[PDB]
């Protein structure tokens, strides 16, 4: 009856394993260390993992004690890790090697190549915006421009 936790820890057989790998310097995210609005950019380019907008699930996996998420999930009212009005870049489709401020204004890269994408599309209207390059040390490429989510977040 205690094998369910081991199955959940090893990885199970539900597709991708339950053992995250984001080994570059990942910061500016994953603030609340509990079951709340969270995010995990993954090593594998193209993995977006988020917990905001929660959901219940079916209880009683292996006739253990009744889980609290049976029909009445626990509530949550705290920090949510995203932005609505105009996403300053993003917090979901990113690489786990980018350092951003708490207010999400500055972007600091890794020892190697890195990028940040956004989460807002443009179809009509004026979007005359700016990227103020605070500083650029030698051997630090600073190419900027629009791209697509299909783009590999670590590819040049």
């Amino acid at each position: 009856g205690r094998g369910a936790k081991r199955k959940q820890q090893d990885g199970g057989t539900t597709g991708t394993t339950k053992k995250a790998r984001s080994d570059p310097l990942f910061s500016a995210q994953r603030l609340p260390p509990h079951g709340y609005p969270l995010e995990h950019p993954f090593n594998k380019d193209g993995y977006r993992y988020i917990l905001a907008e929660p959901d219940p699930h079916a209880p009683d996996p292996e006739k253990l004690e009744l889980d609290c998420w049976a029909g009445k999930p626990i509530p949550g009212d705290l920090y949510r890790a995203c932005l609505y009005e105009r996403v300053l870049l993003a917090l979901h489709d990113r690489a786990p090697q980018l350092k951003i401020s708490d207010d999400r204004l500055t972007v600091v890269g890794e020892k190697g190549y890195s990028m940040v994408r956004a989460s807002h599309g443009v179809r009509k209207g004026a979007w005359y915006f700016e990227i103020t390059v605070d500083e650029m040390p030698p051997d630090t490429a600073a190419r900027l421009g629009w791209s697509q989510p299909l783009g590999n977040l670590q590819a040049p």
Binding site: P24, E110, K111, G112, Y113, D139, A141
Partner: protein, 366 residues
């Protein structure tokens, strides 16, 4: 680079080896064997060049000519002969009334050899006409005097056995400068020898007051007839009081090396700071004969008791030298990738400091 830090073994092509000296940058070794023969070994190539049947009584010193065509030898049986480097026979033969201590060839005058007779004034023997010219000395003429050239050999310096040093010209013999060594605090001191370098005109003096001193070959003709002694550093050994036998100058012009007699303590200092930097760990039991570094590359090689001990810098290039675009190093940082991804008719024809002690012309591949 810096002082030698590795140790090398011995180089004994034949069992006995008395004297050694480098020619200009350590090309060949002049071994005067204790059997009346003159052997030439190869340096930086680990071989032999020529064996000469000089005479019966063994020799005790060796030097080569400015043009490299002669093999002078301060014989123990007063055979002042000019052995040929090429054929090995004797070119010029002469006899001196007193034996010879220090033989040298002026890098600008090979005609006048350097001779240091005992109880008599130094004599320059001219190889062009076999004529002997006595160097004028001062006061006594029966002292243990040693004569030696400067860097360029343009002035000759002589040391006597009462406390007097003389300065004169290598060819004009205009004795116009003298010098009196310090008299300690109560008792005077004689001079054992002096030794020069190839850059800076500095020279060490070894005396009988158990202390090695250093002067420069520019403050005697500047002071005039005779002034007051004023050495830079009165170096000495103040824990064992080892006497000094043979000591030469550096292969760069900034170091000073001094040799023991039986204690296997080879001391080194630098002219800028008179502070000890390293000491040689020699195995006790043998008497040191000759020391002379590589005149360009820092290394030490001391001959003793028929064998030779070398403390050196053994070097083999790193494995990462396969190609400039190929390296075999270790790092834990992410790789920094690249960020920037005629017709003429002319044939090809093009193929310390340097002095004139060259043209040995001695090499037998077979």
């Amino acid at each position: 680079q810096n002082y030698p830090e590795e140790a090398d073994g011995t180089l004994d092509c034949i069992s006995m080896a008395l004297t050694c000296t480098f020619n200009r940058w350590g090309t060949l070794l002049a071994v005067g064997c204790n059997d009346g023969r003159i052997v030439i070994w190869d340096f930086l190539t680990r071989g032999i060049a020529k064996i000469i049947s000089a005479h019966i009584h063994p020799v005790c010193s060796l030097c080569w000519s400015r043009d490299g065509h002669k093999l002078v030898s301060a014989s123990t049986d007063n055979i002042v002969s000019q052995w040929d480097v090429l054929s090995g026979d004797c070119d010029q033969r002469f006899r001196f009334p007193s034996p010879i201590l220090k033989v040298q060839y002026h890098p600008r005058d090979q005609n006048k050899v350097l001779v240091c007779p005992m109880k008599s004034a130094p004599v320059m023997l001219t190889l062009s006409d076999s004529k002997h010219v006595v160097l004028p000395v001062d006061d006594d003429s029966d002292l243990n005097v040693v004569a030696s050239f400067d860097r360029r050999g343009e002035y000759i310096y002589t040391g006597n056995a009462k406390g007097k040093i003389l300065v004169l010209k290598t060819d004009s013999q205009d004795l116009v400068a003298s010098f009196r060594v310090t008299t300690g605090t109560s008792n005077t001191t004689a001079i054992k020898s002096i030794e020069f370098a190839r850059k800076g005109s500095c020279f060490l003096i070894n005396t009988a007051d158990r202390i090695i001193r250093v002067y420069d070959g520019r403050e005697i003709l500047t002071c005039g007839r005779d002034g007051e002694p004023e050495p830079m550093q009165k170096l000495q050994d103040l824990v064992n009081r080892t006497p000094w036998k043979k000591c030469c100058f550096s292969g760069d012009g900034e170091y000073i090396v001094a040799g023991s007699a039986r204690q296997h303590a080879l001391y080194i200092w630098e002219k800028s700071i008179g502070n000890l930097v390293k000491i040689l760990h020699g195995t006790r039991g043998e008497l040191l004969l000759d020391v002379a570094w590589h005149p360009v590359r820092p290394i030490i090689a001391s001959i003793s008791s028929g064998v030779v001990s070398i403390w050196a810098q053994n070097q083999v290039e790193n494995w990462s030298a396969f190609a400039p675009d190929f390296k075999e190093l270790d790092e834990n940082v992410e790789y920094e990738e690249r960020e920037s991804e005629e017709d003429e008719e002319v044939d090809v024809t093009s193929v310390d400091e340097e002095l004139e002690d060259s043209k040995a012309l001695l090499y037998l591949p077979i």
